[PDB]
């Protein structure tokens, strides 16, 4: 049995607040972005870039008004690789509603469906609008984040390369301390001052699993670490940096990355962001960024790093449906020795975005999804968190009602052996 989905039915919930005030703000910014790109669209495509820009804006304005007025969802129309799968899911989701529930709609349906539907409607508007059907309405924002974090990127790249020089000479506890440090940088995006906000910490399980694979690794056999990515800019750098350490420390022999097929939840990494960012680091004029960038493209060339694109990550489906909806992806995940899931949306999809009580075990919240040993590295931006000690979440709600939606708290929450 599984609890109800978080939704905008509870007018006191964060999902309500989010659908009511924040999703319209996202769409307005997107419309602004297309407006501000008029001149660029003209230079590159002539009058018809401008007509396409106006066409897309109208459609996104229609999409906003549906949200504002709680109109029922309509089917997806433009041909695309996941259009039919989407419509099947919508039909299935309507089937879950009884007569009294009416039709799937913005303020009634599961918050997870509501948000993923919205971004997929954004993408439909764009691909409906050639010749700008390539546009990434979030790319300007994602490139800005990279440019605004040059110092931290420089500092992290510098730290990593200093470490690489010495790495051979490290004691296994010294290596473990470096690994925990990089896991913490991967979580937060100073560490001693943030340590009180780690409310669940299974980093020891990550160490035990990986160091045993390393000790017992007989030659020509692989330790695969998969990273299911979240954001671009500095957050992706922290994940690239962690992956590099994983290889340089021989805790892994291959790292596999998964991103999003389409622009998603604003800042989430697509294949174009992944490649663009590694390019900028490689062709940086800073000594340690460039060396990192060269190493990373070299990793990709040798198959030590592999980037994967799969449609499932931009479907509305909970991860419990992956065996049936994307069996090839589940089968691939089963080749991992450890899967790291970054960020809040991955946590929501791993736990169904349901109203679990605080004490429910993570294993049970996963609702059958156990491809391989896995751990969610996540800052809390949603009203859901399982695996807590009794009274722990209750105490936080009483002391700061906002605690699990501000991104202030983080977890390393592991499912697997030991
Ligand atoms: Mg009905």
UniProtKB/Swiss-Prot annotation:
GO terms for molecular function: enzyme binding; fructose 6-phosphate aldolase activity; fructose-1-phosphatase activity; metal ion binding; phosphatase activity; protein carboxyl O-methyltransferase activity; protein-glutamate O-methyltransferase activity; S-adenosylmethionine-dependent methyltransferase activity. Mn(2+) binds at residues 230-231, 268. Its cofactor is Mn(2+); Ni(2+). Its EC number is 3.1.3.-, 2.1.1.-. The modification N6-acetyllysine is found at residue 38. It catalyses: beta-D-fructose 1-phosphate + H2O = D-fructose + phosphate; beta-D-fructose 6-phosphate = dihydroxyacetone + D-glyceraldehyde 3-phosphate; L-glutamyl-[protein] + S-adenosyl-L-methionine = [protein]-L-glutamate 5-O-methyl ester + S-adenosyl-L-homocysteine. Substrate binds at residues 230-231, 344-348, 381. Automethylated. Gene3D superfamilies: 1.20.930.60, Uncharacterised protein PF01937, DUF89, domain 3 (3.40.50.10880). S-adenosyl-L-methionine binds at residues 235, 268. InterPro entries: ARMT-1-like_metal-bd_sf (IPR036075), ARMT1 (IPR039763), ARMT1-like_metal-bd (IPR002791). This is Damage-control phosphatase ARMT1.
């Amino acid at each position: 049995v599984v609890p109800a989905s978080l939704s905008g039915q509870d007018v006191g919930s964060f999902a309500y607040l989010t659908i009511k005030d924040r999703i319209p703000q996202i769409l307005t910014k997107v419309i602004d972005t297309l407006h501000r790109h008029k001149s660029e669209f003209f230079e590159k495509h002539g009058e018809e870039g401008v007509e396409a820009e106006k066409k897309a804006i109208s459609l996104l304005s229609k999409l906003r008004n549906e949200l504002q007025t709680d109109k029922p969802f309509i089917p997806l129309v433009e041909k695309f690789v996941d259009t039919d799968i989407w419509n099947q899911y919508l039909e299935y989701q309507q089937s879950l509603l009884n007569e009294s529930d009416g039709k799937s709609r913005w303020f009634y349906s599961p918050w997870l469906l509501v948000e993923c539907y919205m971004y997929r409607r954004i993408h439909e508007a764009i691909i409906q609008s050639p010749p700008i059907d390539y546009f990434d309405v979030f790319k300007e924002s994602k490139e800005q984040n990279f440019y605004g974090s040059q110092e931290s990127i420089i500092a992290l790249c510098t730290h990593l390369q200093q470490l690489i020089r010495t790495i051979e000479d490290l004691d296994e506890n010294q290596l473990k301390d470096e690994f925990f440090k990089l896991l913490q940088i991967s979580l937060w995006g100073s560490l001693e001052d943030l340590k009180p906000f780690i409310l669940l910490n299974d980093m020891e399980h990550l160490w035990s699993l990986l160091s045993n694979c390393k000790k017992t690794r007989e030659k020509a056999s692989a330790t695969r670490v998969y990273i299911v990515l979240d954001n671009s800019g500095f957050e992706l750098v922290t994940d690239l940096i962690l992956a590099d350490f994983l290889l340089s420390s021989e805790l892994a022999t291959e790292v596999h990355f998964y991103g999003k097929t389409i622009p998603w939840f604003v800042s989430a990494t697509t294949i174009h962001d992944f490649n663009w960012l590694i390019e900028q680091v490689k062709h940086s004029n800073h000594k340690w960024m460039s060396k990192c960038g060269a190493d990373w493209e070299e990793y990709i060339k040798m198959g030590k790093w592999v980037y994967h694109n799969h449609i499932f990550w931009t479907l509305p489906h909970e991860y419990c449906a992956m065996p049936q909806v994307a069996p090839d992806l589940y089968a691939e995940l089963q080749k991992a020795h450890l899967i790291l899931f970054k960020g809040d949306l991955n946590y929501r999809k791993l736990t169904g975005d349901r109203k679990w009580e605080f004490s429910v075990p993570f294993h049970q919240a996963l609702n059958g999804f156990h491809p391989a040993p896995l751990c969610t590295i996540r800052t809390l931006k949603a009203e859901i968190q399982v695996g807590l000690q009794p009274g722990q979440g209750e105490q936080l709600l009483a002391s700061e009602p906002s605690w699990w939606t501000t991104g202030k708290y983080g977890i390393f929450q592991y499912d697997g052996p030991l």
